[PDB]
Structures are given as C-alpha cells and as structure tokens.
Amino acid sequence: DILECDYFDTVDISAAQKLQNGSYLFEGLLVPAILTGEYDFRILPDDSKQKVARHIRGCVCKLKPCVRFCCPHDHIMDNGVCYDNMSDEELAELDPFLNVTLDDGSVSRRHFKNELIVQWDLPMPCDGMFYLDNREEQDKYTLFENGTFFRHFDRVTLRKREYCLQHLTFADGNATSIRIAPHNCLIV
Numbered sequence: 641d642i643l644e645c646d647y648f649d650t651v652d653i654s655a656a657q658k659l660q661n662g663s664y665l666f667e668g669l670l671v672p673a674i675l676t677g678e679y680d681f682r683i684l685p686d687d688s689k690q691k692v693a694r695h696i697r698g699c700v701c702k703l704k705p706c707v708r709f710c711c712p713h714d715h716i717m718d719n720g721v722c723y724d725n726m727s728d729e730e731l732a733e734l735d736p737f738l739n740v741t742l743d744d745g746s747v748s749r750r751h752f753k754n755e756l757i758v759q760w761d762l763p764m765p766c767d768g769m770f771y772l773d774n775r776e777e778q779d780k781y782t783l784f785e786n787g788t789f790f791r792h793f794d795r796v797t798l799r800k801r802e803y804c805l806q807h808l809t810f811a812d813g814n815a816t817s818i819r820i821a822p823h824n825c826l827i828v
Contacts, residue, residue, distance in 0.1 A: 642677030642699050648708065648762050648800040649701035649787070650677075656698065666698060669757075675699040684763050685828060687801065705756050705785045707738070710769075710804035710823060712760045713753050717806035720769040720823065726807070734807055734818040741784050752805075752820055765802050766825035773810065773821065781822060789822060798824065 642650065653676065656666030662673035678696050681689040700706070711722035714731065726734075736752045750756060772779040772791075780792040783805070789798040808821040 641679050642675060642697065645675065645677075645699035645702070646799075647683050648759070649706065650697040650699050651701075651757070651759055652695055652761050653698035653700075654695045664698065666700070667757075669700060669704055671698040671700055671703065675702070682761075682763065683801075685766050700757060701759070701787065705740075705750075706759055706787055706800075707752060707756045708762065708787060708789070708800040708804045709758055709760045710764060710806040713758050715807065716818065717771065717808045717821070717823065720767075720771070722806075730818060735820070738783060738805065738820050741782050743785070762800070762804070765804055765823070766828040768826075769823040770826050771806075771808055771821045771823045783822065789824075791824065802828070 653664060653666050653671060656664045656671065658664055664671040664673065664676055676696055676698050678694055680692060680694055682692045684690055710717060714726055715722050715724050716726045716730065717723065737749045738752055739747050740750050741747050752758070772781060774780050778793050782790040782792065784790070787800050789803040791798070803822055803824055805820050805822050807818055809816060809818050
C-alpha cells in the first residue's frame, strides 16, 4: 500500500499516537504521515495478499534500523517453531547482541531490542526453516543494518521476505546457551 515501501519494512502502528500535522508519533519515533498507510492485507510466505483488519501501518524500517524477527521478542525459536516458554533464567542468559555491518563496512555490536526496532508481525519466511550456526564456517553470514541478509557459504543475498532472526538454544558441547541465530529457507 504505502508508497514505494516494501511490505516487510513496515509495522503495525495502530497503537502509535496520531499527531496534528497528520503524521504519527510511535515509540518516541516520528513516522512522517506520508510513509504511513492503511492495510486490509498481510502478505504470506507463498506471498499473496490475505485479508486482515483495516490496520494502519508504518514504513519505519527506513527511519530507524530494523531486525527481521520470526516471533516476538521474548519468544525462543525451537526447531523453527515459535515458542513462548522462556523462563526468568533463560532470559537472564541470552546474548541480546547481534553483529551488524554498517554502511562503512565495519562491524558494531547492537542490542537486539534497544538499539533497533523489533519487527514480529511479519509472516514466516517458510515452514520448516533451517537455522544457522556461524560457529561453523559454512554457517557464516553478514547481517546489515538495512536488513540485507548475506550468506557466506553460497554468496546469496536474502531480502527480509526470505529470512528472520530469533532467539535459539544452542549446545556448548555439554552445556546450553542462547544466542540470536538467523533462519533461512532451504527451499522458498
């Protein structure tokens, strides 16, 4: 809907404050009125237009960096399935920082939820997704601020329709640690 704005770079702002000059106020962020737009649809993984309540959205990803997420912010991915059973302990043990490569080519550590904008209402990039584990040379990747997900194994670029990060439980051999891992489609 919204002018030259890709879907996945939008957010449900039906909860943001509506200013006088038409524009909106959202989580301290000021979404120019010209970038907002109403929507009766929400694109799918097969990528079509499924009906939805008339909710006003906001192309904010272009006014402040985003982080393509598969599920909300307290949810832990479990075999590609959104799980919401993270105990007070796990949450107190989850590396909240992702490494993102800025425009200038250098890498900066960024809080997943504070220095960025967590998008969670975006449709799954595909059913049955394979997560990644950079610890392994093959699973190496580069997630940019603009959201362009680049994979080093097969030098393939993914647009946010094609990927999403999420909290995922790993295995330190005989232990267990949670770090945000990307998830790619082995097919779509």
